[PDB]
Amino acid sequence: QVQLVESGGALVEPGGSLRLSCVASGFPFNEYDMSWVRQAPGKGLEWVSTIKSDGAYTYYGDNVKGRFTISRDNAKNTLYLQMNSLKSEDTGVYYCAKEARIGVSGTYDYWGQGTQVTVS
C-alpha cells in the first residue's frame, strides 16, 4: 500500500538551514508529481512547493519564493525540501503529498504523516 514518511523536522534558530526528507512506497515515485504542504500552529493549511514527475519544473509559494529548494531523487524514491534562511513564520508542521492527475491541479491522494518544524 502507498506510504509516505517525512523526516528531518526539528528545532532551529531563525536564519538556519534545514533539510526535509520524504520517502515514498507502494507506487511509481517517478510517475506522479509531489508537493509540500505546511500547517502553522492553530492555522489553516498553507502551500509550499511542487516538483513535476521529471523534476523539470518547480513551483514555490510566494512566501518562500527563492528561500526553499525543492528536489527529488526518483532513483531512490525520496523527496527533499531544502529550507534556507528560515524565518519564525515558517514554524509549523510539514506534509508530503502525492498527486494523481497530470500535476497542474491541487488534488492529492495520499499525505504523509508529517514532521513538525519549530523556529524561535
Binding site: 504542504v37 492553530g42 489553516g44 511542487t50 514555490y60 509559494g61 492527475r101 491541487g106 488534488t107 499525505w111
Partner: protein, 210 residues
C-alpha cells in the same frame, strides 16, 4: 486565500454546504478540490475535480461550482463528519496551489451560544517580576470556533498574541483563552488595550486600562 466560513454547523441529519469563493484567477478557470482534516492528523481528499468523489467517500457528499465560487454539500449529518474542511484550486496568477482559510464543522447537539469575554489586566506579582502579560478569557460559546484580535489603543497588535484552540467544558460548551505578552513599559505606555472575539459574524469586545 479563498473565502470559507470559519464555522458552519447543522443539526444531525440535515444537509449543509460549505462555500468557497475566490477570484477569477483561480476557481473560475480551474477545478476545486476538498480536503477533510481531523485535528493533529494528515488531511484527506474527499472531493476532487469538483464533482467527482474518491473511492470510499459516501454518496451523501456532493460538490459543485459556479463561476468564481464553489461549495461542498453534505447530507445526513453525522458525528463522524465533524472536522476541518479545506478547499483548494490552482491559481494561474499565483502560479501555485491556494488553500482556503478552513471551516470547522460541528453537528449541533445543543443550541448556539454566545461567548463570555472576560479581559484580565496584569497581576501585581508578575509586574513585580518586571514581566507583564495580559489574558483574555472566552467561555460558554458554542460551536467551538472563534477569531481573536488584540488592539492597543485603536491600533491592532500584530505580534505577541497567542490563542488556544477551543476546548470543551463540563457542559459541552467550548472555551478558550487568548493571551498577549508584553513588557511592563509597553503596558504602562499605551492608554488601553482591547480583546476582540468573533463568533459566527457576531463579535464581542472588552477593553481595560491601567
Amino acid at each position: 486565500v479563498l473565502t470559507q466560513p470559519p464555522s458552519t454547523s447543522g443539526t444531525p441529519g440535515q444537509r449543509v454546504t460549505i462555500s468557497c469563493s475566490g477570484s477569477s484567477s483561480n476557481i473560475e478557470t480551474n477545478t476545486v478540490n476538498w480536503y477533510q482534516q481531523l485535528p493533529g492528523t494528515a488531511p484527506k481528499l474527499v472531493m476532487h475535480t469538483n464533482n467527482q468523489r474518491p473511492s470510499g467517500v459516501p454518496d451523501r457528499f456532493s460538490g459543485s461550482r459556479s463561476g468564481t465560487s464553489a461549495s461542498l454539500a453534505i447530507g445526513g449529518l453525522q458525528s463522524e463528519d465533524e472536522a476541518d474542511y479545506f478547499c483548494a484550486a490552482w491559481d494561474d496568477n499565483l502560479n501555485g496551489v491556494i488553500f482556503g482559510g478552513g471551516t470547522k464543522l460541528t453537528v449541533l447537539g445543543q443550541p448556539k451560544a454566545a461567548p463570555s469575554v472576560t479581559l484580565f489586566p496584569p497581576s501585581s506579582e508578575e509586574l513585580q517580576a518586571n514581566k507583564a502579560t495580559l489574558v483574555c478569557l472566552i467561555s460558554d460559546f458554542y460551536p467551538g470556533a472563534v477569531t481573536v484580535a488584540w488592539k492597543a489603543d485603536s491600533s491592532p497588535v500584530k505580534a505577541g498574541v497567542e490563542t488556544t484552540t477551543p476546548s470543551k467544558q463540563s457542559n459541552n460548551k467550548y472555551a478558550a483563552s487568548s493571551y498577549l505578552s508584553l513588557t511592563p513599559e509597553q503596558w504602562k505606555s499605551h492608554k488601553s488595550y482591547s480583546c476582540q472575539v468573533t463568533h459566527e459574524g457576531s463579535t464581542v469586545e472588552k477593553t481595560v486600562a491601567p
